[PDB]
């Protein structure tokens with residue numbers, strides 16, 4: 001099935017013009033752990049902020065314009081993105097906001113990191129109804145010497 005994985009501040013904020021004001025290596029380990037050896041679909045702006053192909057994963061970039069890096073797969077529509085994943089057990093949609101909006105109604109699983117931070121952003125994760133989603137996993141973590149904020153990992157499966 002199709003899964004979304006995202007990290008959210010309060011008010012569903014996921015992005016802004018400048019780098020996010022936090023340092024959460026534990027969330028990136030969580031991200032890597034849950035995306036490895038799966039196709040990852042991302043929008044062009046997410047691709048540019050990552051800056052490199054994510055190793056160990058089939059990288060699929062959505063863009064209206066021709067691709068600029070043959071190390072990854074470039075697609076011009078949501079249907080082309082899905083087609084490029086082939087027949088696999090799980091497809092990982094890793095952002096950004098515009099991409100999440102289009103894939104959420106197709107998704108069966110959400111991997112959400114809830115960050116205890118308030119950040120004015122220009123991009124938000126879509127609003128979802130708890131009645132449509134069962135919380136199957138939830139784990140809270142304090143901030144520590146390596147992580148600037150407290151956070152919790154949650155996995156939801158569509159009802």
Ligand SMILES: Nc1ccc(C(=O)N[C@@H](CCC(=O)O)C(=O)O)cc1
Nearest residue numbers: 028029031032035046049050054055
């Ligand atoms: N929006 C982002 C998504 C993933 C990453 C990223 O660097 N992920 C690495 C892990 C980063 C690290 O471990 O240093 C990976 O999944 O392989 C960075 C920004």
Ligand SMILES: Nc1ccnc(N)n1
Nearest residue numbers: 005006007031094113
């Ligand atoms: N898509 C992303 C980017 C960073 N962190 C998580 N958990 N998901």
Ligand code: NA
Nearest residue numbers: 033034035090
């Ligand atoms: Na899993």
